[PDB]
Design a protein around this nucleic acid. Structure first.
Ligand SMILES: [Zn+2]
Lengths: 168, 140, 142, 183, 344, 47
RNA sequence: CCCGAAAACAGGCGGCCACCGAGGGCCCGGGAAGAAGACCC
RNA sequence: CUGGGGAUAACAGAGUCGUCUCGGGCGAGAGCCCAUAUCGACCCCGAGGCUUGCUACCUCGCUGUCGGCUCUUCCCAUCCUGGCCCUGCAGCAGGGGCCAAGGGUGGGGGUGUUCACCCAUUAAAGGGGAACGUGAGCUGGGUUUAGACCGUCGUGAGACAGGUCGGAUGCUAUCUACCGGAGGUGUUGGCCGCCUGAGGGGAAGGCUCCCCCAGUACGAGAGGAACAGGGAGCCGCGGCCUCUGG
RNA sequence: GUUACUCCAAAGGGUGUCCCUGGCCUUAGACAGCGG
């Protein structure tokens, strides 16, 4: 398939409505929560977008697999509540190539529209796996089209990344 | 000396003139099944644009057999040029020539296939290839 | 004629002053052309001047360019660069100048000016090279 | 900046005399003179009660590093006119024993790996080479000259074409002015 | 793409007629022995010898055929001394002294000669120059020389040349020159048999020639031979640059060029047209005379190989500037046969 | 044919696994590329 | 190694004339040079 | 056939780079074990415009031609030649990388072919750019103008981004450019001769084999090196006519 | 670098140098040496 520099920008209108789009495809990604889904952990390691993006589902799935494998091999299912927050709604289209006669693209895939400083994914963990959560952060960051940054969140809604990073 | 006991190659001082280019036919002077060969290559020769490889007395050529007993016909062989019609110079200044153009069929390492050569050969060839002068009666 | 000792002077600033004098109408003689200095890194400087020397017309080498290899001529050429060489005024100005390596007998024991706004104590960083060094690298007899 | 008046001080020993005139430092001891140019903008050198002082008036990190480099150099000059320096070298061979000779301003090594041609190594002015069995000693007053002579002798025996695990013949350094070499 | 090398060399360009028919010498060799560093003569002919090889290689010790060119060298007249000092860019002539008694025929070349100029004035000028040389102002001393082609009945107009002197000490050179001025020089007093020489002359003239001969370009296909372009080149170049390049081969002057040829061995110096073998004296002039030349009568050099120039032409000779390490020894080689048979 | 005198000066080097350059023994990143993967020079055959 | 005083600082040196005349060219017998010119005897 | 049109296609140029070619980041892992000697998934970031397409800014009587022959020059993104580094580098060799474009990179068979395939040699028989360099330089095999045959489609006249046979290649150089040859002026009087040598040009040289080192080091064997030192040739360059041939 | 625009290459890395911050150490700390 085509490079993501074509689809990372957010300047086109939203194109979501299934009852008017003909030939629209289904999602390749199907799982969005992982691990222990009730354990009431302490720390929330969340990724945020630096600027607005459109992320493809191919990338989303690559991230899913990579991160969950790291976390399962080095933490264990009974910990590490992993979640992907954003669903792919926008339909990507390509012009069936005649030339520019009758150019209006046929559907080829899906992406999720993310705005500036919008949470993409989260890993809830306990005190003694922060380093593995941050490894997941870095692995994910490396597979996105634009830049991102992570925060560490406590209960009560507070940002604690400074000091929690300092002590390690 | 590593292996001087029995050697195949020698050293001549003369360097005759390259007289026989690719495409030349040669009468075979030894007692192998071959009778006439044709030159398709000259061993150890690099040229330039549109120039053909050429050989003289004492040089090893690659040839194809054209006439001869059936086991040898259509085979690619190595041979040493042993007689030529074009004049060449000796150290004293005198020119020497022969009556025909003739070769003897050998192995890449230099060993003769055959037991006798019929007629006269050149001293230059007998000197560069030592095992031919033993199976040739007359040497000049 | 004003006589200027180039020992320890920054080449471009010297050349600017000299070009203005020649345009105003004065005769100038520069001595010790080999002892003027050029600031910066040796590799970049030498690469510039070698690239200058390997420039030629592809169809005929008798039509130039003819960038110099000697030190006096390097200095002369810099000054020429600072003048209106395409006009008669500039040509006459350029004829009013002479440059010399070392000090010839004819100028011995004489008054040597100095240009204050060119001087290397003015500098702070020690990365510098000499015009004679450049000439030697390019292959000039001095 | 780091500070305001970085000032380093070296105390002169028993019989040494330091002259400082014009970016050139000169040292006299029991044995031989020694000279060295040490210049950088803003760095000054002069003499005190007995001391050699290096001083700069509003330094940056790089300037600090340079001041302390200059100090190291002066101390080596002083220790060298006071005592001197000596390096040690060892010779090893599997096959083909090599003969090492001192003749003039060159060291000559022959039969290295079986080679008919001898290798040669320069000896810089003011350095003495002795050969005792399988061992070579290089002694003098100038640290840089001594080290350079030793490095010349060691590089005169260098192999690029074959595996150095199996082929180890050569001449190697084992001690630089006291501190031994260890892996 | 098929690759191949270009047609001819760019190192002898422009390929023009020589400035003069007397060749100049641009560089001189370093020779410790204080002597005059060359000589001049006239080409006479070719022949061959048979001799025992002395050069390194195989065939050392064997009898071999060797071709030979003969140069007739009558004695030169040393007529002047010239001094050189150091200029701003290079050497500059300081002063010349000429000798006072000159042959009549020298005016055919130097039309305006001094008139009174007695022996006494000559000695005074030499004293001036000696004092100048003793001061320390002088960087080089050279001799001024002229040929005498009236001793062989070739001409009356002489050739005038300037030669250099070997060694380092300017004072020693000047003493040599002061000895030699006003006297004849013979080639035996300068050259050693068995030496390697460089040879300098102007080549045979051929006039205007085309590029097949001048640069060795290919003759075109037989279709072009029938179309009128057989002995032409194909094209003068590409669309851009939109000009003909100087490197493209074209027609013009071929021959009459200045050339230097390295490392020719002097094999023998003769006397009055005769050469000495073990016992006997033999005339080298062949039966009937050298063609386009006659009879050698004065003094001659044998130089092995070939040299530039037509037969009756001025040749200059110097010692080798670019010789190899494996030299032949500086003695005459053992000669067994010299060809005296007719050459026509 | 072991010669530790020689090993101590033949095999006290580091190598970068990205660029291939040799680097001084007590280093943390590469002279040229800045990479952090530096391994000791193979003092015994591997494989 | 080849070209090279038109190198615009457009050079250095020895000698001749000049401040009728040094010197040059054509013409003549030629060729080792040569499309005309040029070169050489 | 006429009148017109770059308001509008084919082609060279110009733009762009989906596609293409060349790279990189992280690291799933493969490699007795060992992420990175070698190989590197999936995702993500780029360079070039020599591959094809997209567009329609320039040109409709500029030249419209492909391939081959001839001739010159440039780049490096290096096949050989010079020098180095790592190795799952014993030696002989291999694999992967760095500097380096001074020189070399050829001869043949079928086909109009470029390309690709094959043969024998070879140190190797690298590739690109210059209006897919080069028709006021040659050729004209190919490119379905006018004649003709086969197949297929079509009532038919006819057609075929199908095949096959045949089928016009003009030029007295105006200006500039280059190769060489001459005549003037200037250089502050004119003339003869000898020199200096600023500056420009050069590949004037490049490569292979053989002997010896040595059946040695290395190595279980089998195999099998190097420095120095001696000889010969091939390609390129410049000259000459004694010998040999025309 | 010496570019207002017409007409300027990133993901990812370097603490190379100049600066603002926050924790753990510091009358003996980070090594550097003699020893258990
Ligand atoms: Zn690296």
């Amino acid at each position: 398939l085509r490079p993501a520099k074509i689809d990372r920008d957010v300047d086109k209108p939203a194109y979501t409505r299934r009852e008017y789009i003909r030939g629209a495809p289904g999602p390749k990604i199907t799982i969005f929560d992982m691990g222990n889904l009730s354990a009431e952990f302490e720390y929330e390691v969340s990724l945020h977008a630096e600027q607005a993006m459109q992320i493809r589902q191919n990338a989303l799935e690559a991230i899913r697999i990579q991160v969950n494998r790291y976390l399962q091999k080095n933490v264990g299912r009974s910990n590490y509540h992993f979640k992907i927050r954003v669903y792919p709604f926008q339909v990507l289209r390509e012009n069936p190539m005649n030339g520019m006669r009758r150019p209006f693209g046929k559907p080829i895939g899906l992406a999720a529209r993310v705005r500036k400083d919008q949470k993409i994914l989260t890993v809830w963990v306990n005190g003694q796996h922060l380093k593995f959560a941050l490894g997941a952060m870095h692995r994910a960051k490396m597979k996105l089209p634009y830049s991102a940054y992570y925060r560490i969140y406590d209960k009560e809604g507070n940002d604690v990344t400074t000091k929690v990073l300092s002590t390690m | 000396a590593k292996k001087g006991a029995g050697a195949t190659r020698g050293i001549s001082p003369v360097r005759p003139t390259r007289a026989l280019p690719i495409g030349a036919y040669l009468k075979v002077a030894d007692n192998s099944g071959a009778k006439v060969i044709q030159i398709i290559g000259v061993v150890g020769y690099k040229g330039t644009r549109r120039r053909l490889a050429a050989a003289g007395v004492g040089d090893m050529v690659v040839a194809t057999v054209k006439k001869g007993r059936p086991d040898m016909r259509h085979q690619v062989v190595r041979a040493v040029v042993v007689r030529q019609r074009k004049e060449y110079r000796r150290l004293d200044g005198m020119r020497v020539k022969f009556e025909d153009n003739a070769a003897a069929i050998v192995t890449p390492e230099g060993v003769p296939r055959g037991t006798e050569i019929r007629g006269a050969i050149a001293r230059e060839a007998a000197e560069r290839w030592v095992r031919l002068g033993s199976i040739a009666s007359i040497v000049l | 004629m004003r006589i200027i000792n180039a020992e320890g002077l920054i080449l471009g600033r010297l050349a600017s002053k000299v070009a203005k004098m020649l345009l105003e109408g004065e005769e100038v003689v520069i001595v010790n052309a080999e002892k003027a200095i050029i600031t910066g890194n040796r590799e970049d400087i030498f690469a510039k001047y070698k690239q200058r020397t390997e420039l030629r017309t592809r169809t005929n080498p008798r039509r130039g360019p003819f960038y110099p290899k000697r030190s006096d001529e390097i200095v002369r050429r810099t000054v020429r660069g600072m003048l209106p060489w395409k006009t008669d005024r500039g040509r006459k100005a350029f004829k009013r100048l002479k440059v010399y390596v070392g000090v010839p007998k004819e100028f011995e024991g004489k008054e040597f000016e100095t240009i204050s706004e060119a001087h290397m104590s003015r500098l702070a960083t020690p990365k510098y090279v000499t015009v004679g060094e450049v000439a030697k690298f390019l292959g000039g007899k001095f | 900046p780091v500070d305001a008046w970085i000032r380093e001080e070296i105390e002169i020993p028993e019989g040494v005399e330091v002259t400082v005139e014009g970016n050139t430092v000169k040292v006299k001891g029991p044995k031989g003179e020694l000279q060295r140019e040490l210049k950088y903008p803003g760095v000054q050198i002069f003499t005190e009660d007995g001391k050699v002082v290096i001083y700069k008036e509003f330094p940056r990190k790089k300037d600090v590093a340079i001041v302390r480099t200059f100090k190291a150099h002066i101390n080596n000059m002083i220790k060298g006119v006071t005592e001197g320096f000596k390096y040690r070298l060892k010779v090893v061979y599997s096959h083909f024993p090599m003969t090492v000779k001192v003749q003039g301003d060159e060291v000559v090594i022959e039969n290295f790996l079986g080679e008919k041609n001898p290798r040669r190594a320069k000896i810089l002015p003011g350095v003495t080479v002795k050969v005792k069995g399988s061992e070579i000693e290089v002694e003098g007053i100038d640290k840089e000259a001594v080290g350079q002579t030793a490095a010349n002798i060691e590089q005169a025996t260098r192999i690029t074409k074959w595996d150095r695990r199996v082929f180890q013949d050569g001449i190697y350094i084992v001690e630089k002015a006291g501190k031994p070499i260890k892996f | 793409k098929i690759h191949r090398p270009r047609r001819g060399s760019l190192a002898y360009s422009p390929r023009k007629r020589a400035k003069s028919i007397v060749p100049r010498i641009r560089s001189w060799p370093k020779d410790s022995e204080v002597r005059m560093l060359g000589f001049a003569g006239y080409k006479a002919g070719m022949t061959h010898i048979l001799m025992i090889d002395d050069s390194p290689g195989l065939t050392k010790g064997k009898e071999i055929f060797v071709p030979v060119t003969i140069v007739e060298v009558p004695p030169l007249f040393v007529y002047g001394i010239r001094a050189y000092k150091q200029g701003y860019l290079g050497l500059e002539t300081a002063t010349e002294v000429w000798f006072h008694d000159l042959h009549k025929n020298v005016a055919r070349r130097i039309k305006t000669l001094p008139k009174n100029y007695n022996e006494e004035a000559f000695q005074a000028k030499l004293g001036q120059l000696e004092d100048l040389v003793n001061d320390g102002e002088i960087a080089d001393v050279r001799l001024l020389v002229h040929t005498q082609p009236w001793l062989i009945g070739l001409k009356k107009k002489p050739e005038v040349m300037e030669y250099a002197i070997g060694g380092d000490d300017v004072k020693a050179k000047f003493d040599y020159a002061k000895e030699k001025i006003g006297k004849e020089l013979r080639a035996g007093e300068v050259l050693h048999e068995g030496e390697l020489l460089d040879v300098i002359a102007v080549t045979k003239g051929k006039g205007t020639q085309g590029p097949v001969k001048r640069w060795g370009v290919k003759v075109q296909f037989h279709k072009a031979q029938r179309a009128g372009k057989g002995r032409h080149i194909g094209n003068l170049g590409p669309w851009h640059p939109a000009r003909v390049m100087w490197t493209v081969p074209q027609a013009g002057q071929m021959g009459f060029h200045h050339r230097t040829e390295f490392n020719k061995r002097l094999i023998a110096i003769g006397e009055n047209g005769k050469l000495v073998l073990d016992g006997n004296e033999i005339e080298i002039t062949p039966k009937g005379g050298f063609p386009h030349y006659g009879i050698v009568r004065s003094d001659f050099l044998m130089i092995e190989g070939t040299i530039p120039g037509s037969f009756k032409r001025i040749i200059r000779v110097r010692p080798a500037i670019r010789p190899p390490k494996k030299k032949p020894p500086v003695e005459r080689p053992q000669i067994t046969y010299v060809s005296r048979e007719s050459k026509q | 044919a072991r010669f530790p005198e020689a090993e101590a000066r033949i095999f006290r080097k580091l190598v970068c696994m990205r660029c291939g350059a040799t680097n001084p023994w007590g280093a943390k990143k590469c002279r040229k590329c800045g990479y952090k993967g530096l391994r000791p020079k193979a003092r015994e055959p591997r494989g």
